[PDB]
Amino acid sequence: KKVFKIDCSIPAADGIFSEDVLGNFEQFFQDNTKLNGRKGKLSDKVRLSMNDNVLTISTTMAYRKKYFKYLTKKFLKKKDLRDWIRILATGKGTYQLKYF
Amino acid sequence: IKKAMRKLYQVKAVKVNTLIRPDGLKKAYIRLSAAHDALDTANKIGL
Amino acid sequence: VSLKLQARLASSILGCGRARVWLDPNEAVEIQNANSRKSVRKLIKDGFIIRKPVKVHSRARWRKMKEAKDMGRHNGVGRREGSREARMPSKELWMRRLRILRRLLRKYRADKKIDRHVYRDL
Amino acid sequence: PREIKTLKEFLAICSRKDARCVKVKHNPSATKFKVRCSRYLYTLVVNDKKKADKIERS
Amino acid sequence: SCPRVQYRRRMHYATRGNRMMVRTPGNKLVMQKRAKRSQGIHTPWVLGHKRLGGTKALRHIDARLASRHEKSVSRAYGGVLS
Amino acid sequence: GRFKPLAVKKKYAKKMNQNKPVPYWIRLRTGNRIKWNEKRRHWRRTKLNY
RNA sequence: GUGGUAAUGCGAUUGCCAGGUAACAAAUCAAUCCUCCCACGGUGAGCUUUCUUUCACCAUAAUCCAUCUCCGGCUUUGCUGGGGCUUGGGCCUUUUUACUUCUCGCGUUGUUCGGGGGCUCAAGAUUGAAAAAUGCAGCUCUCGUACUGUUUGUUGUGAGUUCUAUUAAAGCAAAAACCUGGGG
RNA sequence: CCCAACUGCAGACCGUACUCAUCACCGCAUCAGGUCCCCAAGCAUAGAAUGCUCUGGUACAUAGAGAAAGGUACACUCAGGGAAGUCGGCAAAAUAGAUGCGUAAGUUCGCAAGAAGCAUUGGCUCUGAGGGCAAUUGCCACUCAGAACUGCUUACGGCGGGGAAUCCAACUGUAUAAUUAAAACAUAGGUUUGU
RNA sequence: GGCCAUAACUGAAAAGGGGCAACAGAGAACCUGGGUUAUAUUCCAAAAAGAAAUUGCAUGUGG
RNA sequence: UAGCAAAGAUCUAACGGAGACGUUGGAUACUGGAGCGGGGAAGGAUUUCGUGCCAACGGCACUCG
RNA sequence: CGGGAACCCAGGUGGAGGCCUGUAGCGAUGCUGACGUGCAAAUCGCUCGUAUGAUUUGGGUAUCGGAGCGAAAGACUCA
Ligand SMILES: [Mg+2]
Ligand SMILES: [Mg+2]
Ligand SMILES: [Mg+2]
Ligand SMILES: [Mg+2]
Ligand SMILES: [Mg+2]
Ligand SMILES: [Mg+2]
Ligand SMILES: [Mg+2]
Ligand SMILES: [Mg+2]
Ligand SMILES: [Mg+2]
Ligand SMILES: [Mg+2]
Ligand SMILES: [Mg+2]
C-alpha cells in the first residue's frame, strides 16, 4: 500500500491552481493514469484519492515514483506551466513542486 | 635550505620542495611549521 | 570579450569537456570578469555557466529487437552472415552439453543407482 | 587503521601519550571513537549509551 | 560515459611487469599496478620441483619482514623440503 | 621528452636566456654596432640538439 | 621456544654449506576484477500536435581486522575447541579397488589412488576498520542554511588466476638483493 | 643479554611545463611521407572487418559565381551484340554472405575442393526442443528446427569469376629502398671434399 | 684492584683485480578526497584533506 | 600566369572590433574508441600558461595563432 | 567410441599446420592509374601478396672502407 503523494508550492497559491487546474489533476490521475495491461480507468486497479494537495495513491503491486514525476510533468505541460514550476521529489515517496 | 632558513630567518621549515627552473635557477617552496606565519616574514623580509 | 579562458577551465571544473559547458551568452562581462577558476566556480554556482545535459542515445530500438529476439523472430537464412560454427560455436555446444551430462552423473552418485559400473560404464 | 575490539585495551591505547586528537563521531546505527595516534588511528565503534559516557572523559 | 585510462607511472609499456583497472571512490576510474605474485617456496628443482605446504609466496618485501614461521614448517629441513 | 640530464638541462636554460631581445637602452649607447640580436633561435627553425 | 598420530600450528638475534624465490616462451578452459548489457528499485533533466517513458546518475582507494555463529549452552557465570565463507590445488590421518575395475577434464589420464574428518595453499568473497563529515548529486527553503536517497542483483566479453598441451635436430635468459634450512 | 611492537626525530640527489604529430619529431617547411607503446564505448555483424552513433575532439586545409572544351575520380548507368577491341580480356563487369545438396580429372592419399555445380534466403504470428534452484511442476535461457501467414523475384555494407591445358620452379619463404618479384636466391633432399 | 665501556692499533680464515652496459629484462616502501591562469600518485597543516607503508638512528613498556 | 583542386560543408543570431576575424548561443555536421581522443618513449626544449600584440611569419585572411 | 575369428565402417572429441579467408602489421602485382615546376629528390589511389610465422617491431649490442654485411640483386652501409 505505497503512498506516493504530490505536493503544491506557491504555484498552488500564487499560481493558478484551482478546480479548473487540479480538476485536471483529478481527471488525468484517472484518465491519463495508466493501469495494468489496458490503461485508463484508475479505480479498480490501484486505489487513489485526492486531498488538499496530497495526491497519494494506495497500490500493492509494482509501482514507481518517477512514474508520477512525468504524468504530472505531462500535466504540468498540459497547462503550459512547465516553467512556472518544476516537479521535484523533496521527500522519500512524494514530490514537491517549486517555481523558477 | 632548512638549516639556512633557521640560520637566516629564525623560523622552522617543515617541507622544503625544490625545483630547478627552466632557467638553471633552483626555486624552493618552504612551509613554515604552521607556527611561524609566512605572512609575518614576507612583511619582515620585505617581500 | 573572448571567453576562451573562462570556457577552457569551466570545462575543467565541471569536468565534462566542451560542448557540455553552456556559457550564458546574454552576459559575457559577467563571465569575462572571472579570469580564475575560483571566480568561475562561483559563476557555475550561479546561472551563467551551466553544463548542458549530455545527449540521449536511444536504446529502445535495440530492446525492441531484444524483446522480439528472445522468444522468436530471430535471424533467418538470409540474415546469417557467418558459419554456424562461428555464430553458435561447435566446441561450446559440446562443452556445455557435456558439463550437463557430468553435472548430472555426479548428482546421481549421491543416492541414485550403483554408481560404480552404472556410472562409469556411462 | 586498527579497530580496538576492547573497552580495556582501547581505554589503554586511547589514553596513551601520542593522542594527536580524539575526534568524536556520530553516524547512523553506531557511535565511533577515533583516537589518532602517531601512526594509526584506533577506532572503537559501539552500539550503546556508553558512547556519551566515555565521551565526557576518556 | 566510458572513460579510458592511463599508465599512471612513468612506465607506459605492457610488459608482464606492469599489468595494471579499478573504479575509485571519486568515480575517477584509474588503473594501478599489481604485484607480480611470485611462485612460492619450492623443493629443489632436482627433487621433483613442488610447492611446499605451510609456506607462502611472499614477495621480496613481504618476505623480508614477515615472521619466519610463514615460510617454514617446524621440521628438519623445513621450508626447503616437504 | 621527460628525461634530460641535469647537464643537458643546464644547457637549454643557458639558451632560453640567450633568446631575449637587445634591451632598448643599448642602442642609445655612444658607438655601439648593435641594432638586432642576430643570434635569436627559434625552436622550429633551428635545433640545438643538446 | 612450545603444541597437534600426522599434514603442520604458535611465540620474541652476528660467519660457511645447501636449497629456494627472483625466474619465464604462446595455447585451450572456470569464479573475482573492470567494461558493457539486462532486470531492479530510487534521483535529475529530456520528449509531448501527438504516443510515451527515453537518457543520465546510483561511487568505495591503498593498508588492515576477523571469519558473526551453525555449535558447545539459543546469552545462568558460559566452559570441552571461539572451527568454520566456498571451488580449484598439494597433502594428512582413518577405514578400501583384483570378477578390471575405477577417478577423471571441454582435452590429449590418473590409479595398482575409492569415501569420512583434517592440515595447509592462492585466488576470492564476507563482515569490520579506512568510510563518510569524502564524492556524485538532487532538494525544502532561501557562497552562507539545512536535511530527506546513498541500492544491489543478472548476463556477456574481456585482461590475470587456473592446468611449469602443442612446433621443436626450437625445450623456451642471467644476477643481485631477498628467503629458508643444515652446521650454530 | 637480544629482538620486536610503541614512540621520537629525520627521509637526501636528479627528472617533472609542453609535445609526441595532416602545426611541435625526421624529411630545408605549419610537407598527403616516415615514427615505438598503453587506454578503447553502442548497434548491425563471424568481427579491432566495414557502416553508423554516445564520450572526448574538431568544423581559421582560401573563398565565391557559373553547365564550356578537356581533364581527374575510394563515380555512375547505357538499347542491341558480347572480346568483333587489343601485343594481350589490359580495364571494367561479373562472381560473392549463409545454409543445404552435390563435386571429376589427376594424385606424393594428405589433397585437388569453396571444385565445378545447383538450391533456399524477406517480414510476420507461432509451435518445438535445448537449462540452473526440491519434497514434479516451480523460476533464471537465446540458439537452432519446422509450420503457415504475408510480399521482393526490385533493394546498405562487406563479400572467390570459374574450367581446360602447356611451360618453369617442388612448396611457405627471401630479394634489384628510387623502372626488373622472376623461371633468380633460399630451401628440404642428394652427393662430394677436408678434418 | 677488578666490577662494567667505548676506542686505538694490530691482525681470523677467506682464490679467482676493478668497473661499466636495461627510463620496456630484474628490481622498486602511497593511496584515495580536494583547494592552479599553466604542476600534482609532487601541492593541502593541525577537527595535517586524510589514510598507509617504509628506512636510518634513537629513547623506553615485553622477556 | 601555372596554380592555391587528395584529406571535414559552415549556417545563423548579437557581441566584440578601426574593420573577411574572433567569442558566446543555437543549428547541421565530421572524427567514430587501430580517432582531428587521453597519456608516454625517441626526438624537440619553452612550443605550456596568461595578458597583450598583428609590423612579418601562419602559401587566403585574421580582431587569432 | 558406438557395431562385427583378423582389423574396416561410421559418431564425436581435440585443435595441429613455415595450411586457407581475412584486420592490424609487414610488403608492393596490376592499373605500365593519378602526380611527374609533386603532397613527395619515389608520393597517392584502387587492386594486390602475406598475415603463428625462415614473421613483424622497439631499445640495447656487435661487424665498415683496397671493408662490412648479404635467402646473393654486385644489393645495402645516414638521399
Ligand atoms: Mg619458481
Ligand atoms: Mg624457474
Ligand atoms: Mg560458463
Ligand atoms: Mg642464483
Ligand atoms: Mg605530416
Ligand atoms: Mg637536416
Ligand atoms: Mg560528439
Ligand atoms: Mg550495352
Ligand atoms: Mg554470353
Ligand atoms: Mg593486406
Ligand atoms: Mg630509451
Concatenating the DSSP letter of every residue in D4-15 gives ---SHHHHHHTT
Cα–Cα distance, A64 to A49 (Å, whole number): 17
Other beta carbons within 10 angstroms of residue B39's beta carbon come to: 9
CA of E64 to C1' of H6 (A): 21
CA distance D35 to D30: 16
Q: Give D54: exposed, middle or buried? Use CB within 10 Å, 0-12, 13-18, 19+.
A: middle
Name the nucleotide with the smallest C1'–CA separation from F12.
J45
> In angstroms, rounded to a whole number, what is the distance separating the alpha carbons of residues A86 and A95?
10
Cα C78 to averaged position of ligand 9 atoms, centre (Å): 29
Residue–nucleotide distance: D48 CA to G72 C1' (Å): 28
> How far does the CA of residue B14 sit from the closest CA of chain F (Å)?
26
CA distances from F14 to B21, B28, F9 (A): 12, 20, 9
> Which residue of chain B is at minimal alpha-carbon distance from F18?
B23
Hey, what's the cell of D41?
588511528
- Best of B21, B23, B25, B26 to substitute, by most chain F Cβ atoms within 10 angstroms, is B23
Q: How far is CA A35 from CA A47, A63, A71, C40, in A?
A: 11, 10, 13, 48
- Per CB-CB distance under 8 Å, the chain B contacts of F6 are 20
Between the alpha carbon of residue E15 and those of residues B14, E36, E39, the distances in Å are 39, 11, 18
Cα dihedral C9, C13, C17, C22, rounded to 10, equals: -80
Judge contact between A6 and A29, C-beta under 8 A.
no
* Residue in this structure with the C-alpha cell 630547478, named with its chain if needed: B20
Give strand letter and number of the nucleotide nearest C8 (CA to C1'): I37
Which experimental method was this entry solved with? cryo-EM
- B40/A62 Cα distance (integer angstroms): 67
For strand G, list residues 52-81 of chain C whose Cβ lies within 7 Å of it: 53-60, 62-63, 66
Residues of B in contact with F14 (CB under 8 A): 24
Look-up of cell digits 634591451: F23
Beta-carbon neighbours within 5 Å of ion ligand 1: E 39
Q: Is F6 part of the contact surface with chain B (CB cutoff 8 Å)?
A: yes
Structure resolution, Å: 2.8
> How far, in Å, CA of A5 to CA of A49, rounded?
10
- Cβ partners under 8 Å of residue C28, min gap 6: C1, C3
Contact at CB, F10 and B23, closer than 8 angstroms: no
Name the neighbours of D, counting chains with at least 3 Cβ pairs within 8 A.
none
Q: Which amino acid is at F28?
A: L
Length of chain F: 50
Query: Dihedrals φ, ψ of E51, to 5°?
Result: -70, 140
F16/B23 CB distance under 8 A: yes
Q: Is the CB of residue F15 less than 8 Å away from at least one CB of chain B?
A: no
Between the alpha carbon of residue A89 and those of residues A4, A77, A81, D35, the distances in Å are 10, 18, 18, 39
